Scaffold this active site. Sequence first.
Site, PDB file in Angstrom:
ATOM      1  N   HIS A 197      15.835 104.030  54.489  1.00 26.82           N
ATOM      2  CA  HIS A 197      14.551 103.347  54.256  1.00 26.82           C
ATOM      3  C   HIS A 197      14.106 102.599  55.513  1.00 26.82           C
ATOM      4  CE1 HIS A 197      16.739  99.487  53.145  1.00 26.82           C
ATOM      5  NE2 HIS A 197      15.654  98.955  53.692  1.00 26.82           N
ATOM      6  N   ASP A 225      20.544 106.359  50.733  1.00 25.98           N
ATOM      7  CA  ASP A 225      19.818 105.519  51.641  1.00 25.98           C
ATOM      8  C   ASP A 225      20.726 105.396  52.866  1.00 25.98           C
ATOM      9  OD1 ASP A 225      17.978 103.951  52.798  1.00 25.98           O
ATOM     10  OD2 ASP A 225      18.442 102.098  51.521  1.00 25.98           O
ATOM     11  N   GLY A 261      15.827  92.590  56.386  1.00 30.78           N
ATOM     12  CA  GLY A 261      16.087  92.688  57.820  1.00 30.78           C
ATOM     13  C   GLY A 261      17.579  92.836  58.083  1.00 30.78           C
ATOM     14  N   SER A 269      19.054  95.115  56.002  1.00 28.59           N
ATOM     15  CA  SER A 269      19.135  96.538  55.613  1.00 28.59           C
ATOM     16  C   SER A 269      19.596  97.398  56.771  1.00 28.59           C
ATOM     17  CB  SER A 269      17.789  97.043  55.151  1.00 28.59           C
ATOM     18  OG  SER A 269      17.474  96.414  53.930  1.00 28.59           O
ATOM     19  N   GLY A 270      20.419  98.397  56.442  1.00 27.34           N
ATOM     20  CA  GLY A 270      20.937  99.366  57.403  1.00 27.34           C
ATOM     21  C   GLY A 270      22.209  98.937  58.116  1.00 27.34           C
TER      22      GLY A 270
END
Length: 240
Positions: free
Chosen positions: A45, A93, A186, A188-189
């Site tokens: 995402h 994801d 922020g 995320s990932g």
Amino acid sequence: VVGGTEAQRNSWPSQISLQYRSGSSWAHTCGGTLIRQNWVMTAAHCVDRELTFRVVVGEHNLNQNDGTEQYVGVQKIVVHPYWNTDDVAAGYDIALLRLAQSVTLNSYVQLGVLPRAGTILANNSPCYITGWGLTRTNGQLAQTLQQAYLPTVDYAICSSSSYWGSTVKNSMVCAGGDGVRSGCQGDSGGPLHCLVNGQYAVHGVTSFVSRLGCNVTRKPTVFTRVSAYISWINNVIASN
Ligand code: NA
């Protein structure tokens, strides 16, 4: 990261900042994990938007010269083929970024160790989330890399009705849920680092939190489970 503490500079050397170009500057949008000298693991995402992306390794403070940063363009983006941006709860994801150059490894810049395929942590397993995400729900990004102690919440509990219900899948890791500390926008990932037989490994890729807030009791932060994606990862790197 809500309810975090500032990380030591060299605690999490596989942590990267994924940034997009924003006028004459760059803005942090997401975290990532250096897994090869030219390959970063992140959330699918984080790269749904059609932006110009770069990776910063050896990054500690988004707003100051650390003296340790290397800045690299994203040359190729490979998203999991089953990812659907309108269905994050479906899973998948995860994305790999091939970098335009191979980064140099030192104490600030290291490959993230990944778990063996199939590995599932016991409930309440000790983990840290790291990142520059909001420090409060509806807050602002951290300057300095933050970490928060987030024990895992197993699939049976996490997918129970007072937690995440059907929204959580076995392809995901849940961690935290204490109403104090969490992932936030922020982060995320970026990695979930969990201590297993004396060694931290990246068991999680930060995927999502509740729409109600980041630090919401019984809405632990949800991560794509890395150990479910080992072959997919190897397959992408081996053919790219
Ligand atoms: Na910096």
